[PDB]
């Protein structure tokens, strides 16, 4: 596999995942100023902006490491937020809608 088409695919896939986050709940890091206890609960924060930085830093060289950071966005939000919140339900929705984006993207990567 060649690096350039793979990274193009990851860029497109990240854009598609961001489209599913219609409230932009996951676009940027959880603001530690407004959630002071966040790092008490979440060992590795993640968000789509950090994922973009990691992608461009060549930190994602296989689909699993891209998907692992996506799964961190979801799992961190399920962990931190109570089930009766918009935040929790948004992570459930992103897991469902984003999973479908990821499966098709991984098949494209496997054809490379
Ligand atoms: C992605 C996420 O877990 N975000 C957040 C959870 C909880 C809170 C929060 C709820 N109450 N106080 C902070 C957030 C506040 C601002 C921005 N993001 C928040």
UniProtKB/Swiss-Prot annotation:
It is found in: Nucleus; Chromosome; Cytoplasm. High levels in testis. Acetylated by KAT6A. It is linked to Intellectual developmental disorder with dysmorphic facies and ptosis: An autosomal dominant neurodevelopmental disorder characterized by delayed psychomotor development, intellectual disability, delayed language, and facial dysmorphisms, most notably ptosis. Additional features may include poor growth, hypotonia, and seizures. Component of some HBO1 complex composed of KAT7/HBO1, MEAF6, ING5, and BRPF1. Component of the MOZ/MORF complex composed at least of ING5, KAT6A, KAT6B, MEAF6 and one of BRPF1, BRD1/BRPF2 and BRPF3. Interacts (via PHD-type zinc finger domains) with unmethylated histone H3 at 'Lys-4' (H3K4me0). Interacts with trimethylated 'Lys-36' of histone H3 (H3K36me3). Interacts with ING5; interaction directs BRPF1 to H4K4me3-enriched chromatin at the 5' of active genes. Interacts with KAT7. Scaffold subunit of various histone acetyltransferase (HAT) complexes, such as the MOZ/MORF and HBO1 complexes, which have a histone H3 acetyltransferase activity. Plays a key role in HBO1 complex by directing KAT7/HBO1 specificity towards histone H3 'Lys-14' acetylation (H3K14ac). Some HAT complexes preferentially mediate histone H3 'Lys-23' (H3K23ac) acetylation. Positively regulates the transcription of RUNX1 and RUNX2. This is Peregrin. It comes from Homo sapiens. The lineage of its organism: Eukaryota, Metazoa, Chordata, Craniata, Vertebrata. The gene is BRPF1. The chain holds residues 628 to 739 of 1214 of the full protein.
């Amino acid at each position: 596999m060649q690096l350039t088409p793979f990274l193009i695919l990851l860029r497109k896939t990240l854009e598609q995942l961001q489209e599913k986050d219609t409230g932009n709940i996951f676009s940027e890091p959880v603001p530690l100023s407004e959630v002071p206890d966040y790092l008490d609960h979440i060992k590795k924060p993640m968000d789509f902006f950090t994922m973009k930085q990691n992608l461009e830093a060549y930190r994602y060289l296989n689909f699993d490491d891209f998907e692992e950071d996506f799964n961190l966005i979801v799992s961190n939000c399920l962990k931190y937020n109570a089930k009766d919140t918009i935040f929790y339900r948004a992570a459930v929705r992103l897991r469902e809608q984003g999973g479908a984006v990821l499966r098709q993207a991984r098949r494209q990567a496997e054809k490379m």
